[PDB]
Amino acid sequence: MKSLQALFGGTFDPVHYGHLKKVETLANLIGLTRVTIIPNNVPPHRPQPEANSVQRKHMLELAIADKPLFTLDERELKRNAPSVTAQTLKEWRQEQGPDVPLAFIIGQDSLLTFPTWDEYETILDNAHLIVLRRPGYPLEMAQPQYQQWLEDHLTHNPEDLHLQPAGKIYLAETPYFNISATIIRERLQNGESCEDLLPEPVLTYINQQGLYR
Amino acid sequence: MKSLQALFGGTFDPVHYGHLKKVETLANLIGLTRVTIIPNNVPPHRPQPEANSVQRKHMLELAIADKPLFTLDERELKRNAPSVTAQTLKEWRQEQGPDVPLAFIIGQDSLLYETILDNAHLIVLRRPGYPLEMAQPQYQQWLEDHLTHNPEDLHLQPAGKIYLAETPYFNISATIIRERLQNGESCEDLLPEPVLTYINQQGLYR
């Protein structure tokens, strides 16, 4: 077949070394060669992002330009409706075909919440999901009847991600980074440095556009 | 439709008249007829309570026994995982339905997540004397976008709107209570009488 393709979403307000370094360390132990970044739009019942739809795309494009691994998909940005995770994966399965391996990247704090998701079941119908292990936390699912759901689809051999179209779940050892989007936004208002939490081009764009200040 | 159902969580180590008399006052200004107290369990990355999961249920049961407005729900005490509010709420939205109104009670100091408005309203116990200051002024707009001053909107919509309710002041917290108990100064004004008897029977907070 062709190579496995991984998808990796978020708001990215702003994009930071956490998103990038975490995924490219994953790809060095799993053999991933191509990752597509799908930025979201926040549904109106939540706080809306500080950086607008355009700036977040610009900030992404800058961090990603020197990195062949990543590529950018602006579906949800050009989309009328709010971003629903199972809808984007149902589209990629349609366009890409049924025989190509697809995987969806999530953190551990979001897998312990996975059944809280709209069409949480229909996700594993289209792609794998690679869970970024948060070191120091257990795998405790809220209702221990989809603690079985985690056990029915868990695999420890990454070959399954590369040799099957969908359906498996992988937990991956990631490093720790003490950076988030709220940290950086706060470190900016407080006036403390950030040349190690943020790509240097992205931070220059932030200073030039006056965001988070 | 059905009645509005309000949920009110917390550690309750112990429960006291500040919790009770603040919400039944709310109940009189909002017109809600049912409140479900949902005691929580603290994840180990915080100092753990002094009274254990059984004793805190008991002190709760004694306090709620004679109040029809309140009913208890020990989802989180019998659950393996740490209690996460957006997890319990969507469970309530799951078990109750999409057309009944739901609301969640929180103090003002604790709200200062996004996911709440998916399934329920959020009624903020206003800290009297303090302003509406949100830290990062991008969900200060979110606070302003979904605020409402007509309690009807809470009774006619399943979720989405935010109400800030005037509550009275009491000089009573579990930290106040434990210290007045560990040194030995009285507390018959801060707790219902059956709860103080359970505390004095169980050797709690000394």
Contact A49 B142 (CB under 8 A): no
Tell how far CA A204 is from the center of its chain: 24
How buried is residue B91: exposed, middle or buried, by Cβ count under 10 Å (0-12/13-18/19+)? Answer: middle
Method for this entry: X-ray
Please choose, from the candidates A111, A117, A46, the residue with its C-alpha nearest in 3D space to the C-alpha of residue A86.
A117
What is the three-class DSSP state of A207? Answer: helix
* Pairs of CB atoms within 8 A across A/B: 44
Question: At a CB cut-off of 8 Å and minimum separation 6, what does A122 contact?
Answer: A86, A90
Q: How many angstroms separate the CA atoms of A13 and A23, rounded? A: 17
The secondary structure element, H or E, covering residue B6 is strand B5-10
Q: How many angstroms separate the CA atoms of A61 and A71, rounded? A: 9
The H-assigned helical ranges of B37-105 are: 53-64, 85-96
DSSP string, A69-113: TEEE--TGGG-SSPP-HHHHHHHHHHHH-SSS-EEEEEEHHHHTT
Tell how far CA B43 is from the center of its chain: 18
Q: What type of residue is A176?
A: Y
Of B82, B90, B117, the CB nearest to A45: B117
What is the three-class DSSP state of B91? Answer: helix
Contact B118 A142 (CB under 8 A): no
Question: At a CB cut-off of 8 Å and minimum separation 6, what does A25 contact?
Answer: A174, A175
Please choose, from the candidates A39, A29, A1, the residue with its C-alpha nearest in 3D space to the C-alpha of residue A130.
A29
Resolution (A): 3.0
Q: How many angstroms separate the CA atoms of A96 and B88, rounded? A: 37
Name the one residue in this structure whose structure tokens are 């206003």.
B126
Structure tokens at B127: 């800290």
Is residue A52 within 8 A of residue A8, CB to CB? The reply is no
Is residue B7 within 8 A of residue B36, CB to CB? The reply is yes
Please report, to the nearest 10 degrees, the dihedral formed by the alpha carbons of residues A200, A202, A203, A209 taken in order.
150
Contact A116 B86 (CB under 8 A): yes
Question: Could you tell me if residue A136 is left (phi over 0), alpha (psi between -120 and 50 degrees) or otherwise beta?
Answer: left
Go through the domains of chain A in sequence order and give each one's CATH number.
Answer: 1-213 (3.40.50.620)
